[PDB]
From a paper:
β‐1,2‐Glucans are natural glucose polymers produced by bacteria and play important physiological roles, including as symbiotic or pathogenic factors and in osmoregulation. Glycoside hydrolase (GH) families related to β‐1,2‐glucan metabolism (GH144, GH162, and GH189) have recently been created by identification of two β‐1,2‐glucanases and a β‐1,2‐glucanotransferase, respectively. Structural analysis of the proteins in Groups 1–4 revealed that they possess (α/α)6‐barrel folds similar to those of GH144, GH162, and GH189 enzymes. Overall, phylogenetic, biochemical, and structural analyses revealed that Groups 1–3 are new GH families, GH192, GH193, and GH194, respectively, and that the three families belong to clan GH‐S (clan GH, classification based on structural similarity) as GH144 and GH162.
GH144 protein from [name] (XcSGL) was also used (Section 4). Because hydrolytic activities toward β‐1,2‐glucans were detected for PgSGL1, PgSGL2, PgSGL3, EeSGL1, SkSGLc, and XcSGL, the general properties of these enzymes were investigated using β‐1,2‐glucan alditols (see Section 4 for details) as substrates. While many of the enzymes showed optimal pH values around neutral pH, the optimal pH values of PgSGL3 and XcSGL were 8.5 and 5.0, respectively, which suggests that the optimal pH value varied within the SGL clan. XcSGL can be regarded as an SGL because of its narrow specificity for β‐1,2‐glucans and a similar level of specific activity toward β‐1,2‐glucans as the other SGLs. Comparison of spatial positions of predicted acidic catalytic residues suggested that Groups 1–3 and GH144 had the same reaction mechanism.
Residue numbers in the entry: 55 to 496
The structure:
């Protein structure tokens, strides 16, 4: 199905987000903007993937993108590293999730050294490694620094419980007691750990990652799949990795793949909004999509003569696990699933843009979220009230923006996937996890 012109505008504004809102002195992209409290290393991951999308669509010159990319990779290479409570950006090749926008160190002491967030960064880093393949000495320098940053990550260090990778680490309390367990958006964590030639993990790590899959497998809204409620779980890893046809052991046994798993998640989200058992306002066949993102406030209000819990930033979803629902829809959820179900995502995007766009579609594309049900006369943590038209976010969230841009690019010409199909570490990672068939086939 071809894309209407609206999608080329969405692609562009969302690229422009990462180009503009990033600090150019160090290449740190904000967690959110315009609030701009601090940077996220996961923002940076999506930024590095964004810049070459801009080159190919002519929104930025190759030379600007190189200069920006080099600034970014050199910032991380040269950042102070160490176990100390202040003054460091990272440790053991990992980095703090959140760094100060100007000085680049751990924002504050509540900030963890993050495995999944380092992971997301590294996806962008390896993207730069496989994209900037020219004989420019700058592109060569990009390849080498990227290579160095990936090799320094000590995945093994974070294996506290057996082959399973911990979520992170604090100077003040030691390892985080939670582990990355399936199913969710962390497939690419274990891929990166499996593909490492310096500090790599064993195939075992994947096996046990999959042990908890069977808590999530079942039937929701007419579909049989791994039913993690938050849409993004089905998107982040799929940004860089093409999951069509290739099958690991679990999917070989189920007889599907992770691409079909995302597609099933997306139709189910849609059918959830059609049934709309919670009877949230405007939920319907072309107004849907629940995932982690902003909302109006931590509160309880009466809605249709019942008491309903409402959150600001929170996991939101539609599925058998982690399925909180406020009435707030995040555009990234439907849009970033363009590649999985374009026959429903296209009219969804058009419908939300038409109905809501005079307040929802702003300078850098879709704002993070909106809630047509929320018209209470109360203080907000963020966003704003539009009279008799509900609530809308005031911030964009980079990790919500990143997949909007990258998944539209993958729809148009499979650009992001094709670049990563050239990275030796991603391939190795997948092969060592047990993946076979499709493009992995020799
Ligand atoms: O309380 C932490 C600080 O949160 C700040 O709020 C920011 C907000 O952070 C979210 C966080 O979003 C990140 C998320 O991935 C993180 C990961 O969450 C995973 C989840 O893990 C749970 C743990 O977080 C939790 O401690 C334990 C408690 O028992 O339960 C775990 O299940 O598990 C699901 C699977 O079921 C995963 O899908 C989910 O990703 O938690 C890790 C451990 O800390 C983090 O390292 C990891 O970053 O998603 C992306 C990565 O895909 C990441 O960029 C997000 O930032 O999610 C948790 C759990 O949902 C929230 O509690 C937390 O509020 O992130 C947004 C966007 O970046 C940012 O705008 C917010 O500012 C507060 O500001 C801080 O004050 C607070 O200390």
């Amino acid at each position: 199905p071809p894309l209407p012109p609206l999608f080329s505008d969405i692609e562009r504004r969302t690229f422009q987000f990462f180009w503009d809102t990033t600090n150019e002195l160090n290449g740190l992209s904000p967690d959110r903007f315009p609030s701009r409290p601090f940077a996220s290393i996961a923002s940076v991951g999506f930024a590095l993937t964004a810049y070459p999308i801009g080159i190919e669509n002519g929104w930025v010159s190759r030379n600007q993108a190189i200069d920006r990319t080099l600034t970014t990779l050199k910032f991380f290479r040269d950042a102070p590293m160490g176990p100390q409570r202040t003054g460091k950006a990272g440790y053991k090749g990992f980095y703090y999730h959140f760094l100060d926008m100007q000085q680049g160190n751990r924002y504050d002491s509540w900030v963890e050294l993050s495995s999944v967030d380092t992971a997301l960064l590294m996806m962008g880093v390896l993207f730069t490694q496989s994209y900037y393949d020219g004989d420019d000495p700058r592109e060569k320098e990009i390849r080498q620094i990227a290579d160095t940053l990936y090799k320094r990550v000590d995945w093994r260090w974070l294996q506290q419980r057996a082959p399973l990778i911990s979520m992170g680490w604090f100077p003040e309390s030691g390892f985080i007691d939670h582990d990355w367990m399936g199913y969710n958006q962390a497939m690419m964590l274990y891929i990166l750990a499996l593909g490492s030639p310096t500090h790599g993990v064993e195939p075992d790590a994947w096996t046990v990652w999959t042990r908890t899959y069977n808590n999530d497998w079942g039937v929701y809204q007419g579909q049989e799949y791994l039913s993690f409620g938050p849409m993004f779980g089905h998107q982040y890893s799929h940004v860089w990795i093409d999951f069509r046809d290739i099958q690991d052991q679990y999917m070989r046994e189920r007889g599907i793949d992770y691409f079909l798993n995302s597609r099933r998640a997306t139709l189910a989200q849609r059918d959830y909004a059609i049934d709309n058992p919670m009877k949230w306002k405007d939920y319907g066949e072309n107004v849907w999509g629940l995932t982690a993102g902003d909302g109006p406030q931590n509160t309880s209000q009466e809605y249709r003569g019942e008491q309903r819990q409402f959150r600001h930033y929170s996991s939101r979803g539609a599925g058998l696990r982690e399925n909180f629902d406020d009435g707030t829809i995040a555009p990234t959820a439907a849009i970033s699933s363009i590649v999985f179900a374009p026959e429903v995502v296209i009219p969804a995007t058009e419908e939300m843009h038409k109905r809501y766009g005079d307040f929802l579609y702003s300078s850098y594309g879709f704002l993070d979220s909106f809630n047509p049900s929320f018209n209470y006369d109360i203080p907000l943590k963020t966003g704003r009230m539009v009279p008799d038209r509900g609530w809308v976010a005031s911030d964009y969230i980079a990790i919500d923006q990143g997949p909007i841009l990258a998944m539209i690019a993958n729809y148009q010409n499979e650009f992001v996937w094709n670049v990563m199909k050239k990275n030796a570490y991603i391939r190795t990672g997948l092969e060592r996890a047990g993946f076979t068939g499709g493009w992995l086939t020799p």
